[PDB]
Amino acid sequence: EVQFLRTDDEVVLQCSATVLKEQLKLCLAAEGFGNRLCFLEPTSNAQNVPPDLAICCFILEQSLSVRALQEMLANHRTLLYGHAILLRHAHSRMYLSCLTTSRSMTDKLAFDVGLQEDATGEACWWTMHPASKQRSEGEKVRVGDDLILVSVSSERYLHLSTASGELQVDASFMQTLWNMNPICSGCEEGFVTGGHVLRLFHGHMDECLTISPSDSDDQR
Amino acid sequence: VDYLLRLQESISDFYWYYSGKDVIEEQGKRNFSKAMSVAKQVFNSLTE
Amino acid sequence: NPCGGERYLDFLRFAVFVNGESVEENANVVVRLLIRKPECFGPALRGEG
Amino acid sequence: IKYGESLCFVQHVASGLWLTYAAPDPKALRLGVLKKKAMLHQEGHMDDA
Amino acid sequence: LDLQKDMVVMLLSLLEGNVVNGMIARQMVDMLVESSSNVEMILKFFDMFLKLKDIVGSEAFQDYVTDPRGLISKKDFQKAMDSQKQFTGPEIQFLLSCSEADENEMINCEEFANRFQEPARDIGFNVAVLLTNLSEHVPHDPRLR
Amino acid sequence: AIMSFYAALIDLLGRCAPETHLIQAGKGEALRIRAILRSLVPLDDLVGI
């Protein structure tokens, strides 16, 4: 069976690089508070070192056609190729956006990618385009598809940059293939799901599992 | 079916273009009418 | 090939500019095409190097 | 298996690798060639069929 | 409206020869559920423009009607709709907009009610047939009920 | 030849720039195109040339 992405779903944006001839998968991550810039969190070595996935999760708030988005700016739906999407950081609740600044020494035409507090303007909207002829515009986006994100405001691709020593993410005129891997779609009410933050109580004795307070002698 | 999907997307684009405007002008009306005639023929072909 | 590049740029200029005013329909299309093929900007305006 | 309709993934039986296309050749535009070298990979791509 | 009729005829043709819990019927139900809000708007349009004919036929609204010419004012029309309670406020506003009032805010009901009766009826009947067919061939769908 | 090519490219982009009346009207497309052109050509480079 084929699964389609829908609004209000949680996703991770994943890209692939080749480092020492070994495939490495990376997820787009951002802290939001104290640092709005997006970076890449590797996820290929998860069996040895767990990745920091709490900050890699994005919710698909809206999906509109370009004309509808233009009308809205002038003023659960399935995603379709050629639509514009709005991605909200799950942790900070900011919005993925193409920034006007740039800290890239290698590329003069590139822009920084980060989070912005509000969803106003066209800087926080991205258009999805198929990576291959297998898919066509207006076709529903299927889980595991390869797509290209184009910034509406800057017309630049969400691009993986390897020019420097390390792997960075920016908005440039060179394209990169991204996977919108689903994390959760809809939780049956009252049921536990992975990635949730909770407390583990000792039965019902009102005792919880915890660590020692800060500055404790046991090093927490 | 593929041509019908293309035509439907074009018609949706036209509707979104004219959605804000209070009234549709004569040229827009003529274009809408032509698109609808083609769509009608395509639907009849599928029914056949 | 700067010479051929200049010839094609001249044609595009005449396509986009008419009677002292910019034709928006042509200008937007030309700009989008140029950014979609960045090599048209020449090696100097190349992003990477 | 049907001609045209069926979509088939080719797998090397002994190693389990999948038949796919190698990574895009650098300076492909300067080459002017659309050939894509085929290879056997552990993961492949979504359009390998 | 004619184009919509042709599309509905195509859907019925798809349903020709259907079986109970047939795959085509289930897929059509899924498509309708996916387009639920727009289907709701279409049904509301047809239902409103039949209920308005019924209301103008009704004598209670004609009591609010006072002008000897039979044309009612916008405020009188609004009050009559409110009294009948068949329409909510946004709907009342919509029919007021479609009323085609004159420069004197006079609504010609004898034409307002009849404007879309003929064109609507065909598509309305075809949509009713489609819904009945789907309901009788997919009897256990909460979305369809 | 190189100087002429770059001069022709800058001339074409400038002619592609939107009109002032569109800018005042605040058309989103016009503002976006002007932003793209400013991204392409820095002001300090123009002043230096």
Swiss-Prot record, chain C:
Function as written in the Swiss-Prot or TrEMBL entry: Cytosolic calcium-activated calcium channel that mediates the release of Ca(2+) from the sarcoplasmic reticulum into the cytosol and thereby plays a key role in triggering muscle contraction following depolarization of T-tubules. Repeated very high-level exercise increases the open probability of the channel and leads to Ca(2+) leaking into the cytoplasm. Can also mediate the release of Ca(2+) from intracellular stores in neurons, and may thereby promote prolonged Ca(2+) signaling in the brain. Required for normal embryonic development of muscle fibers and skeletal muscle.
Record PTM Phosphoserine, positions in chain: 22
Protein family: Belongs to the ryanodine receptor (TC 1.A.3.1) family. RYR1 subfamily.
Included stretch of the parent chain: 2325 to 2373 of 5035
Cellular localisation: Sarcoplasmic reticulum membrane
Organs and tissues of expression: Detected in muscle and myotubes (at protein level). Ubiquitous. Detected in diaphragm, skeletal muscle, esophagus, spleen, submaxillary gland, adrenal gland, cerebellum, brain and in testis germ cells.
Official protein name in the record: Ryanodine receptor 1
Record PTM: Channel activity is modulated by phosphorylation.
Domain notes: The calcium release channel activity resides in the C-terminal region while the remaining part of the protein constitutes the 'foot' structure spanning the junctional gap between the sarcoplasmic reticulum (SR) and the T-tubule. Pore opening is mediated via the cytoplasmic calcium-binding domains that mediate a small rotation of the channel-forming transmembrane regions that then leads to channel opening.
Inactivation phenotype: Perinatal lethality, due to severe defects in skeletal muscle development. Neonates do not breathe and do not move. Mutant mice show defects in muscle fiber development. Their muscles do not show a contractile response to electrical stimulation. In addition, mice display abnormal curvature of the spine, thin limbs, and an abnormal rib cage.
Subunit: Homotetramer. Can also form heterotetramers with RYR2. Identified in a complex composed of RYR1, PDE4D, PKA, FKBP1A and protein phosphatase 1 (PP1). Repeated very high-level exercise decreases interaction with PDE4D and protein phosphatase 1 (PP1). Interacts with CALM; CALM with bound calcium inhibits the RYR1 channel activity. Interacts with S100A1. Interacts with FKBP1A; this stabilizes the closed conformation of the channel. Interacts with CACNA1S; interaction with CACNA1S is important for activation of the RYR1 channel. Interacts with CACNB1.
Curated annotation (Swiss-Prot), chain E:
Domain EF-hand: 59-87
Disruption phenotype: Perinatal lethality, due to severe defects in skeletal muscle development. Neonates do not breathe and do not move. Mutant mice show defects in muscle fiber development. Their muscles do not show a contractile response to electrical stimulation. In addition, mice display abnormal curvature of the spine, thin limbs, and an abnormal rib cage.
UniProt modification remark: Channel activity is modulated by phosphorylation. Activated by reversible S-nitrosylation. Repeated very high-level exercise increases S-nitrosylation.
Compartments in which it is found: Sarcoplasmic reticulum membrane
Tissues expressed in: Detected in muscle and myotubes (at protein level). Ubiquitous. Detected in diaphragm, skeletal muscle, esophagus, spleen, submaxillary gland, adrenal gland, cerebellum, brain and in testis germ cells.
Top-rank taxon: Eukaryota
Family named by the database record: Belongs to the ryanodine receptor (TC 1.A.3.1) family. RYR1 subfamily.
Record's subunit section: Homotetramer. Can also form heterotetramers with RYR2. Identified in a complex composed of RYR1, PDE4D, PKA, FKBP1A and protein phosphatase 1 (PP1). Repeated very high-level exercise decreases interaction with PDE4D and protein phosphatase 1 (PP1). Interacts with CALM; CALM with bound calcium inhibits the RYR1 channel activity. Interacts with S100A1. Interacts with FKBP1A; this stabilizes the closed conformation of the channel. Interacts with CACNA1S; interaction with CACNA1S is important for activation of the RYR1 channel. Interacts with CACNB1.
Known function: Cytosolic calcium-activated calcium channel that mediates the release of Ca(2+) from the sarcoplasmic reticulum into the cytosol and thereby plays a key role in triggering muscle contraction following depolarization of T-tubules. Repeated very high-level exercise increases the open probability of the channel and leads to Ca(2+) leaking into the cytoplasm. Can also mediate the release of Ca(2+) from intracellular stores in neurons, and may thereby promote prolonged Ca(2+) signaling in the brain. Required for normal embryonic development of muscle fibers and skeletal muscle.
Domains (record comment): The calcium release channel activity resides in the C-terminal region while the remaining part of the protein constitutes the 'foot' structure spanning the junctional gap between the sarcoplasmic reticulum (SR) and the T-tubule. Pore opening is mediated via the cytoplasmic calcium-binding domains that mediate a small rotation of the channel-forming transmembrane regions that then leads to channel opening.
Full protein name: Ryanodine receptor 1
Organism whose genome encodes this protein: Mus musculus
Taxon lineage: Eukaryota, Metazoa, Chordata, Craniata, Vertebrata
Gene that encodes the chain: Ryr1
